[PDB]
Structures are given as structure tokens and as C-alpha cells.
From TrEMBL, chain B:
InterPro entries listed in its UniProt record: ATPase_V1-cplx_csu, Vac_ATP_synth_c_sf
Keywords, in A-Z order: Hydrogen ion transport, Ion transport, Transport
Family the entry assigns: Belongs to the V-ATPase C subunit family.
Provenance organism: Citrus unshiu
Annotated Gene Ontology cellular component terms: vacuolar proton-transporting V-type ATPase, V1 domain
Function according to Swiss-Prot or TrEMBL: Subunit of the V1 complex of vacuolar(H+)-ATPase (V-ATPase), a multisubunit enzyme composed of a peripheral complex (V1) that hydrolyzes ATP and a membrane integral complex (V0) that translocates protons. V-ATPase is responsible for acidifying and maintaining the pH of intracellular compartments and in some cell types, is targeted to the plasma membrane, where it is responsible for acidifying the extracellular environment. Subunit C is necessary for the assembly of the catalytic sector of the enzyme and is likely to have a specific function in its catalytic activity. Subunit of the peripheral V1 complex of vacuolar ATPase. Subunit C is necessary for the assembly of the catalytic sector of the enzyme and is likely to have a specific function in its catalytic activity. V-ATPase is responsible for acidifying a variety of intracellular compartments in eukaryotic cells.
Stated name of the protein: V-type proton ATPase subunit C
SUPFAM superfamilies for this protein: Vacuolar ATP synthase subunit C
């Protein structure tokens, strides 16, 4: 009966991994969307 | 084997009917004594001090001969496959015991130098020591082979405390429990019988633990793959075969070295003939004694004959 439960456990692990990846995705996106007001002070403000 | 059994009598102290009768036509024929000898003097002999030094070194020479004899009789025979070298195969100085003891031809240039034997005796002793060292090397090789023998095959034949992978069934583990229903697919039966297998499954540890060690008698773990056990058994068989071959082929070389040691002992007896001649007669080597392995009655008769030079 736990043969099908193995699939459920694998699905739960994959869902947890995907949830962690998505949670870090917002931070990764904000790492570039934000703080560029500082990097533009060197990329173009130097000009 | 047999220790030294040579008689002591110079040329001037022959115990036979005549001085030259020691070799043949002696009264020993009537008593069936196997005594026989043949002269083989060296080129020259040392002085009185040299004779005394040789007599002193004769004790060490006899000790070395005894050590070689003990090694040859023990290492070869104990292997139960090296004692195949008979008297002819182990002939001393190229002649069997019938002829080796009847002559001193071993005094040729092989072990000694066919020269004043004061240092030639030491040289022959060193050669015999080298031969004994080779025999000891062969014995050590035989011991290492026996260490290779009694290998992993000495363990149990599977489904037991040791080497149980040979009887493995190859979520499950090698249990072989010698004298279950749950969510897990416990409806199974492994091939772990050399023993018995029980219903178990890795999906839920309840059935697996119950079958393995939970109740009754705990099972014995073993390697999962029987290929490793088969390889270990094959290696053990190969090591046993190699040990047997060494006891039959390398120990055949050991038996050849034992025959060489017998030749060295014949040379030592030839030297001891001249040593006794110097001790109880003049310096030049000349002896009329004999070397054999007679019975008690024959030795007593020889002593009665030679009582003119008793100790």
C-alpha cells in the first residue's frame, strides 16, 4: 500500500524544493530590480 | 632424520683384519656391518696449532650440520608433500647413501678447494650455511603460503555468522534468521536459504524489523552482493592451491636443497675423517675408519675390535 505512498513522498519533496526555489526567486529578482540605483552611481554617474 | 654416525679411526688405527682391509674383506662382513669407506686425502694439512683450531671448529661444524639435518627433516616432511626426494634424489655428493658413505669424494673442488683445509673447512661450512639459509627461505615461503591457506573459505558456508553472503538471496537485507501484515508489501519470500526467509518489506519498518530481529532470535547480517563472497571463495581456493603447489613444487626445490645439504654433510664427514686422523695420528690426512648406520651389536663388535684405540 506504501508503493503509491512513495510517489506521494516524492511529490511532496519536489513541491517543497519548488516552493523553496520560488521563495528565493523573488529575492533573486529583487537583487537586480533593486540596488541598481547604487550600481548606476558607478556605471553611468562616473560619466 | 639421522644424526652423525661415523666412526673415528686414523689410517694407522684400522679396526679391520688388515690396515687396508677397512674398505673390504674385514670381519664386519661376517657381522653384516654396513661400514664402508674410501680414502680421499687433501693436498696438504696444517700445523699442530692449525690442527687444534680445526678440532675446535669441528664442534661448530657439527652443530651446523645438525641444524641443517633438523631443518631438512622437519620443514620438508611437515609439508606432507616435500618428502618425495628419495636417497637417490637426495644423493650426497652425487652418490646414494650406499655409495656416498663408502667414499669421501665430496672433498673435491665443489665445497672445499682441494688444498690445505684449515680455511677450506670454514669455506665449506659457509657454503653449507648458505644452503641452509636457502632452505630456511623456502620454509618461510611455505609458511607464508600456509598463511594464504586457511583463507576466507575457513568461515561458515553461508546463512551463518561469517561468510553468509554466499547464501544470500541475491528494501530488504540479508537476514537468514535460523530457528508481518502491514501497509508495506510484506507478501514476499526471499531466497536466503543456505536457513529460512520471512515476510518483510522496506516500505514500512514494522514488518522488516519483525522478520529480521524484533522478536524470537535475531538474524545475522551479511553482504548484500554474493559476487564479493564468490570472489573471496575463489581467491581462497586459489591461495590453497598455491600453498599446495609450493608444498609440492617450491618444497620440491626445498627437497633439492636438502639433498645439497646431505652432500654438504658428506663433505663435512670427509673433513672430519682428516680431523680425526690429525687428532689421533700424524698431521697428513690419512684415515682408515668407516661411516655407516649399523645396529647395536655391530657397533659393539667394532668397538671390541678397536679397543686398542678406545676413548
Amino acid at each position: 500500500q506504501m508503493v503509491r505512498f512513495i510517489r506521494q513522498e516524492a511529490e511532496e519533496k519536489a513541491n517543497e524544493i519548488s516552493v523553496s526555489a520560488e521563495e528565493e526567486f523573488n529575492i533573486e529578482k529583487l537583487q537586480l530590480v533593486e540596488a541598481e540605483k547604487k550600481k548606476i552611481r558607478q556605471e553611468y554617474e562616473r560619466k | 632424520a639421522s644424526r652423525y654416525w661415523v666412526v673415528s679411526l686414523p689410517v694407522q688405527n684400522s679396526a679391520a683384519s688388515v690396515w687396508n682391509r677397512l674398505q673390504e674383506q674385514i670381519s664386519k662382513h661376517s657381522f653384516d656391518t654396513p661400514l664402508y669407506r674410501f680414502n680421499i686425502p687433501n693436498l696438504r694439512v696444517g700445523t699442530l696449532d692449525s690442527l687444534l683450531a680445526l678440532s675446535d671448529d669441528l664442534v661448530k661444524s657439527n652443530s651446523f650440520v645438525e641444524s641443517v639435518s633438523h631443518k631438512i627433516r622437519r620443514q620438508i616432511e611437515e609439508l606432507e608433500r616435500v618428502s618425495g626426494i628419495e636417497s637417490s634424489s637426495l644423493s650426497v655428493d652425487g652418490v646414494p647413501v650406499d655409495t656416498y658413505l663408502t667414499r669421501f669424494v665430496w672433498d673435491e673442488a665443489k665445497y672445499p678447494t682441494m688444498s690445505p683445509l684449515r680455511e677450506i673447512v670454514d669455506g665449506i661450512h659457509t657454503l653449507v650455511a648458505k644452503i641452509e639459509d636457502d632452505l630456511k627461505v623456502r620454509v618461510a615461503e611455505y609458511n607464508n603460503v600456509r598463511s594464504q591457506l586457511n583463507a576466507i573459505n575457513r568461515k561458515q558456508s553461508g546463512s551463518l555468522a561469517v561468510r553468509d553472503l554466499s547464501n544470500l538471496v541475491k528494501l530488504v537485507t540479508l537476514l537468514a534468521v535460523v530457528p508481518t501484515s502491514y501497509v508495506v508489501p510484506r507478501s514476499s519470500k526471499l531466497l536466503y536459504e543456505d536457513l529460512y526467509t520471512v515476510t518483510l518489506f522496506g516500505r514500512v519498518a514494522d514488518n522488516f524489523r519483525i522478520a529480521a530481529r524484533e522478536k524470537g532470535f535475531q538474524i545475522r547480517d551479511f553482504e548484500y552482493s554474493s559476487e564479493a563472497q564468490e570472489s573471496r571463495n575463489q581467491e581462497l581456493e586459489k591461495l590453497v592451491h598455491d600453498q599446495e603447489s609450493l608444498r609440492s613444487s617450491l618444497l620440491q626445490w626445498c627437497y633439492t636443497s636438502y639433498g645439497e645439504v646431505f652432500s654438504s654433510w658428506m663433505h663435512f664427514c670427509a673433513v672430519r675423517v682428516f680431523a680425526e686422523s690429525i687428532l689421533r695420528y700424524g698431521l697428513p690426512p690419512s684415515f682408515l675408519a668407516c661411516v655407516l648406520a649399523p645396529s647395536v651389536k655391530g657397533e659393539k663388535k667394532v668397538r671390541s675390535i678397536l679397543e686398542e684405540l678406545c676413548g
